[PDB]
Amino acid sequence: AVDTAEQVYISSLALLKMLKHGRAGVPMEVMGLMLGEFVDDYTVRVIDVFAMPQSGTGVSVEAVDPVFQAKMLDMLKQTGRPEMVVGWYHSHPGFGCWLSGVDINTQQSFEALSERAVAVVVDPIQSVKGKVVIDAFRLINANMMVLGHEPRQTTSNLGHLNKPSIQALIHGLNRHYYSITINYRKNELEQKMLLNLHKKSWMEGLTLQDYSEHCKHNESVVKEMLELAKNYNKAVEEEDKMTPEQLAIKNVGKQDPKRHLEEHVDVLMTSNIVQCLAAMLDTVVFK
Template structure:
C-alpha cells in the first residue's frame, strides 16, 4: 500500500472527481495520508517562523503554505498529501491569509505548472499556530481559518478537488519531540450535528469553557481527520540502513532540543505565578464552606473543571465564595496540568539518560 500512495490510476481518479461523493456528505472524508517529504517541509517551514520572530525580538510568526495531493481512488474516503509548498505569507495570532495579489498570482501559476508536470493539484493549505505552551494543543481553526477554509471548499469541492486544512503547533512539537499537527474540514453552514456538544475529534465535552480552550470559539463548525504517514519501500530500506548504522549517534544525542530546554524556565515561572495568584488559604476555606452546604456530599469529586454538577439549595448560582473557589480551582487545575506535562517530559529525558548509561557504561 505504501508505494501505491505515490502512484494512481488517472482514469479512476478522474471518475472519482466527476462523481464528487463528498458534496452530499458533510463528514465524508475520514483520513489523511501524509508523505515524509510533506511533513518535513511543513515542520521546517513552521519552525522558521518561530525562529524569525524570536530573532527580531518579538513573538513567533505564523506561516502558511499549500498542500499538493489528491483524493485516493482506492480508498475514496482518504486524502493523500504528497508534497507542500511554503508561501511568503506571515501573520500573527489567529490571522494568516493569502490576500496579496502577487502571492495569489504565484499560487495560480505554480498550481497550473504542477498539474501539467506532476498531474496533481493543490488540494489544501497549512498554517502554524505558534502560541504559548499550555495544557492543550493549539491545533484548531479560528474564525478567520473557518472563513478561509469554507471559501476554498466552496470553490474547489464542486470541481472534484476536495480541500483540506492542516494546522501545526511548532512550539509544542519541539517540546514533545514529535509533530503536533492536525487536519480539518469545515461543515457547510447549513449543517448541524445531531450529537450535542460534539467536538471536532468526535469527543463529547459538556463543559463550555473546556471546549473553547481546546477547539476555539468555532468548535462546532469543523471536524478532524485522522492523520497517517506513508513511506515508499525504497525509502523504508534507506531508513533501516541509517537506523542500523547510526543508532549509536541517535542514542548519544540529547533528547530535547536546545530551543525546548530554553523554554523550561518560562514555563515554570508561568505556573508559579498562577499558583501564587491563587490565594491558597482563601481557596481552602471557600472549598470547605462549599462542601458543608446542603445538596453537596463530602465526596463531590475533583474541583477542577468549573461548577459542580450537584445542586445548590441556598441560591441560584451559589454564594460568591463558591464561585470564587470554582475559579481558583480551575486556575490551579490548569497549572497542575502544565506541571504534569512538564514532569512527563523530564521523566522521558531521564529514562533516555538511563538507557544511554546502561548501553555505553
C-alpha cells in the same frame, strides 16, 4: 454525506516541509498550499506541499501577488508530473490546533471549488520528539448548527478513537468543524533510507581515546567516589530510625549517596571495558 472514517493519507515527505517552514518563521502564523492526488469519497492523499510569500500582522496573516501561484504550479507540472492543490495548511505557533475566526474564513473561500479542501494545523512547538499535534480539520455547516441536527452519520467505529483537547473544545470544535484521524504512508522506498542514512559514523570506535588521559580520567571519578562512599559509609548508619518514607521527603535538599553511588559504577565500567577491548583488537589486526 460523509461517514466520519475519512482516513487522510499524507506521506513521509510533506511533513518535513511542513515543520521546517513552520518553525523557521514560528511566532508568526506561516502557511502554504497542499498539492496532492484525490481518491474516493472516503480517503484523500496529499503528497506535495509548498508555501508562498505572505504578509502578516499579529492576529492575521495574508497572502500577496497571486501570479506566484500559477507560475509555481506550471513548473511543478513540467518537472515531475502534474497534481492539484489537495488543500491548504497554516501554523499556530505554540497554541494547539483549532480554527480561529480568521482561519475559518479563508477555509470558507477554499471549500467552494472543491468541497474537500483539507484544513491542516501544524504546531512546531508542542511537538517535542514524538507526538506532532497535527489534527487536520474540515468545516461543518453552521446552518445545521441552527437546525440542532447532528451531522456526519457515523457508520464505522474508527472516528471516535482520538479524543480532542479541552482547549480546542473551547474553540469552534465541535460547532463549526470536525477532526479527522490520519496516519502516515510508509515504504521501503523511504523508510529504509532515512534509518540507514542518518545516524551513521565511520571511525568512532576503531580508535583509541586520549591514552594518557583515559587512565587519568580513571582517577578523576574515583577520587570523589571515595568521599561519596563515605556518605554511603554514613547514610545506612542512620537507619533503623524514623520510618524511611520520611527518608524520602526529608532528603530532597541534598544528594543521596545510594543513587549517586551506582551512577559512576556504570560510567567507570563502560569507559574501561570499551577502551580495553578496542585496544586488544588492534594488536591482532594490525600485524
